[PDB]
Design a protein around this ligand. Structure first.
Ligand SMILES: Nc1ncnc2c1ncn2[C@@H]1O[C@H](COP(=O)(O)OP(=O)(O)O)[C@@H](O)[C@H]1O
Ligand SMILES: Nc1ncnc2c1ncn2[C@@H]1O[C@H](COP(=O)(O)OP(=O)(O)O)[C@@H](O)[C@H]1O
Lengths: 160, 126, 375, 74, 375
């Protein structure tokens, strides 16, 4: 999600205005102003594609943040950036392995909170406590408080 | 924090890690230079006569055999580590296998083609 | 978008052809393995009209065409017709020329070698593909399902192959192929619908009965209970709409068609059915293999799409199986398309690139090379 | 048979890598050049040894990470 | 991972290698002396899959492997497989680097010198051990048991050595080397289970029968009484679960197998039997020794764990023994593990610190040194 959310933040106002015009086509006549599988299917067919009901439900589930079963405009912008890549290929595991070693300052095999904090400060961006805590919670999937090698690869998946 | 902020931090984190990797390589090259200065010191040939030069060549040749044996010994340890790395890599892959085979979809109609079809000439920035 | 010389993937069966690009998760389109030909004398001129029609063209213009299938009971019998099926698949709908892409074609484990040899020959000689590989459908089904181990029960349109795999290895002595498949089930249905007063024999009619089967059959986990009621009351009949506005209602015949998979004698086949071949593939494997195969019967092919077959199969295998043992069925949404999906998985593996037959290897050895390099 | 072969083999390899030197047909200037050539061979071997030592350390790190991943995923 | 340069101890039998470090009272793990190899052709791509599996890997993946042991009645004949077993033992599970530790291995005193010379050679030449010792299994069980005197009866998986020891001394003229062990008992059981309708031939089946014997069998204090009863009533049957959910019940076969130890003729062997070889080792010793060996019939290894064996062996010797003499079996819980345990004790004795072959002594003396320094 994070790489796509960043791409959305960076869209210009004119680009968002064009996406809004497209969104309005998709939700024309919808009871709640949102895109359900009935509006998504009618547009995909209008576009020449023939998705199954399951494919349509999965396209919505991939960006549905509230659990509405529908796509709102904010969710739509994520759908539209996900449908395109600037970040093609996305590197690979061998390159992430060498980068992992650079985060692991004590060479223990894990990235701890102090290591993460040192690396974040080095970026030059203002780092708040919330930036540190949130990235470590996003990375450490087993709740030990550290990022292992396999968690690091999931953590940096798709990051250019 | 927004996911958009997290991405920017992750992209900058990877850029610094890459810089540190280059830094490590440069430092290792410096370390290599110094190690070689100690292990393989320069020849002093001035003043050696013919017989002394013949003995030096024999002495250097003998050293070549000894260094090659030391190199062999480290190489053997490196070789054993490759076998272990290959076996552990297969083990982790299998432990981390199960239900995780990945897929891609083509339901993701490119937003460029979609925008040209739905908006026509209105579609200029996207 | 395709900005990389990705391998092309196509599964060519006796029924339909699944095709798309490696790296996608579905065929882009499914092209029936049909070449249609006009069977009437023309009167108007300047009407276009082809010598032959293919895939969806063959079905769209079928009102006056006889429709032939180049593939039967698992093999290609007419490879000149397949060159046209493939040409259309690649150049008209996928809009890709194989000349710039490796191509992956698939077959059953004991499939006659002529099938893989002609698949290899046509793609190298008429399409000039830079590389070829013929894969095993059972591998691909396991790849789509997230398995390395299980019984692949692949009843399709022309054949049921039935092949056990353990840790990625075939157990060939435990393969039990049957001449029992969806095409025969269609024929069984045509005969019993004839008994009801709806006699279907011509191409248009044969295609209708196939369509009826696909939409109305539910197989029945308990067929004795279903025949007792379905044959006694209209409350279990389903109405089907025909192209000319006619309606046919089907009762116990609705499940008697699929029943042939459990009672093959219905179509003249000497067999114990699909649930027993699944079971025998487990039983001919060693006892330290059997436990994993019992827990992983893997559904592939198309008969796996009846609303009730997973229960019909689990009930039959567990009935044949020893007690204590846990008998399970793996029946993912990747149903009917698991070979194509597996094809995309295989084609895109880094561990598969050395397995390709290159055009240079082909030109030096000829098509028999596929028999030596693939499996 | 095979273990004896392995011990004989590391020595056989090292013997194979041993070149034959002769210093009688060479004059003083040629001997100085020959000495520089042997020195450079020693230097290159020491440089290769250094690279292997560095690799060995990265390998121990990688092995420790793999062992931790296995222990955490089991 | 050890914090001291403690000697390593490994008991390499035809069955399992017991291994751990000196100073403990048990091995860290038991590593079956098995190297497995796939016996099938792989079909799926990207499955990993190695040419061979070792120890517990060999048993865990056995469903498609053929499994072989490198040790034949106490002698290693397949050294490639033992290097894999030893490497796995130190490298993956004991978490040991032999380069930093003396290593003690064990062996029957009656085996060909080739085995003790080669074990000495591999630890010094392949594993770079700083020191070696190969110890006698009669000695090792006696140390573990707290005894200096007795007849040590292994009845193991590989060999029965039948060796009398008095006041720490060997009495070699009284030794009965016997070619009868658990590996033969297992084959006998497979033939009599075949008589019951359960045919066990292949590796999975061979490992099942060895498991059946280990969990269901006994010798019987009185064979004929158990024989007549078990042959007459189901009350003497015991069940076993086969891995595929099927079951087997075993009747008099439950004891007919173990009985071969007392009656070697059951497998075509020409032998006195373990109770007579034990007896003859006492009988052939001097008249003032006999009384101490009668009172010290010492167990070693496995099979000594069978119900009725400690009581039966004492009765069988008593029945052959002169009156006045008091006959007793020493059957400690340190059973099936006493040889390894003795290795731990021996390696650690202050009186044994000079018995170790050092690397320097080995290199100067050559492999024959084991004959001058160990036994
Ligand atoms: N819901 C269904 N009910 C009954 N039969 C079905 C159903 N879905 C597919 N089939 C049949 O399965 C066969 C298609 O098998 P499939 O594996 O998906 O294509 P192929 O073998 O050519 O790759 C056809 O005979 C089709 O009529
Ligand atoms: N409880 C038991 N019942 C029957 N046989 C046994 C039992 N325990 C051990 N044995 C047998 O003894 C052997 C294992 O004992 P062990 O002496 O530890 O082998 P090793 O010499 O490799 O260390 C096997 O053949 C096993 O069948």
């Amino acid at each position: 999600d994070d790489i796509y959310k960043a791409a959305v933040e960076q869209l210009t106002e004119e680009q968002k205005n064009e996406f809004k015009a497209a969104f309005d086509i998709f939700v024309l006549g919808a009871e709640d102003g949102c895109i359900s599988t009935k509006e998504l299917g009618k547009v995909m067919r209008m576009l020449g594609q023939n998705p199954t009901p399951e494919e349509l439900q999965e396209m919505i589930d991939e960006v549905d943040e509230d659990g509405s079963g529908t796509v709102d405009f904010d969710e739509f912008l994520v759908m539209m950036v996900r449908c395109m890549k600037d970040d093609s290929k996305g590197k690979s595991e061998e390159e992430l392995s060498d980068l992992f070693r650079m985060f692991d300052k004590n060479a223990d095999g894990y990235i701890d909170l102090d290591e993460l904090k040192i690396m974040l400060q080095a970026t030059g961006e203002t780092i708040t406590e919330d930036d540190i805590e949130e990235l470590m919670k996003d990375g450490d999937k087993n709740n030990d408080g550290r990022i292992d090698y396999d968690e690091f690869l999931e953590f940096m998946k798709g990051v250019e | 924090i927004s996911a958009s902020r997290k991405l920017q931090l992750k992209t900058l984190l990877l850029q610094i890690a890459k810089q540190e990797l280059e830094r490590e390589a440069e430092e290792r090259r410096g370390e290599k230079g110094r190690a070689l200065s100690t292990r393989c010191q320069p020849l002093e040939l001035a003043g050696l006569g013919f017989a002394e030069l013949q003995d030096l060549c024999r002495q250097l040749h003998a050293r070549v055999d000894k260094v090659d044996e030391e190199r062999y010994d480290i190489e053997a340890k490196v070789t054993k580590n490759i076998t272990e790395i290959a076996d552990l890599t297969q083990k982790i892959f299998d432990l981390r296998g199960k239900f995780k085979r990945p897929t891609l979809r083509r339901v993701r109609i490119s937003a460029d083609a979609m925008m040209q079809a739905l908006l026509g000439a209105r579609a200029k920035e996207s | 978008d395709e900005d990389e010389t990705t391998a092309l993937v196509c599964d060519n069966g006796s029924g339909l052809v699944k095709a798309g690009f490696a790296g996608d998760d579905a065929p882009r389109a499914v092209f029936p393995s049909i070449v249609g030909r006009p069977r009437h004398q023309g009167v108007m001129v300047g009407m276009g009209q082809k010598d032959s029609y293919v895939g969806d063209e063959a079905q769209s213009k079928r009102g006056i065409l006889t429709l032939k299938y180049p593939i039967e009971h698992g093999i290609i019998t007419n490879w000149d017709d397949m060159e046209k099926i493939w040409h259309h698949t690649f150049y008209n709908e996928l809009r890709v020329a194989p000349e710039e892409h490796p191509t992956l074609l698939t077959e059953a484990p004991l499939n006659p070698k002529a099938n893989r040899e002609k698949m290899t020959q046509i793609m190298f000689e008429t399409f000039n593909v830079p590389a070829m590989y013929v894969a095993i459908q059972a591998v691909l089904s396991l790849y789509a399902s997230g398995r390395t181990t299980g019984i692949v029960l692949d009843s399709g349109d022309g054949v049921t192959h039935n092949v056990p795999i353990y840790e990625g290895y075939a157990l060939p002595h435990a393969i039990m192929r049957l001449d029992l498949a969806g095409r025969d089930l269609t024929d069984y249905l045509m005969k019993i619908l004839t008994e009801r007063g709806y006699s279907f024999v011509t191409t248009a009619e044969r295609e209708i009965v196939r369509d009826i089967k696909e939409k109305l059959c539910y197989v029945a986990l308990d067929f004795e209970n279903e025949m007792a009621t379905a044959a006694s009351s209209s409350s279990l009949e389903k109405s089907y709409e025909l192209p000319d506005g006619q309606v046919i209602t089907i009762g116990n015949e609705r499940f008697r068609c699929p029943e042939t998979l459990f009672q093959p004698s219905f179509i003249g086949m000497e067999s114990a059915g699909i649930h027993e071949t699944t079971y025998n593939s487990i039983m001919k494997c060693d006892i330290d293999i059997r436990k994993d195969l019992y827990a992983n019967n893997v559904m592939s092919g198309g008969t796996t799409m009846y609303p009730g077959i997973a229960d019909r199969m689990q009930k039959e295998i567990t009935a044949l199986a020893p007690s204590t043992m846990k008998i399970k069925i793996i029946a993912p949404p990747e149903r009917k398309y698991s070979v194509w999906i597996g094809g995309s998985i295989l084609a895109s593996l880094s561990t598969f690139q050395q397995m390709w037959i290159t055009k240079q290897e082909y030109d030096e050895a000829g098509p028999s090379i596929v028999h030596r390099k693939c499996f | 048979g095979k273990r004896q072969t392995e011990r004989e083999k590391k020595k056989k390899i090292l013997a194979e890598r041993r070149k034959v030197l002769a210093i009688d047909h060479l004059n003083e200037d040629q001997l100085r050049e020959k000495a520089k050539e042997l020195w450079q061979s020693i230097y290159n071997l020491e440089a290769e040894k250094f690279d292997l030592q560095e690799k060995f350390k990265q390998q121990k790190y990688e092995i420790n990470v793999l062992r931790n991943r296995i222990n955490d995923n089991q």
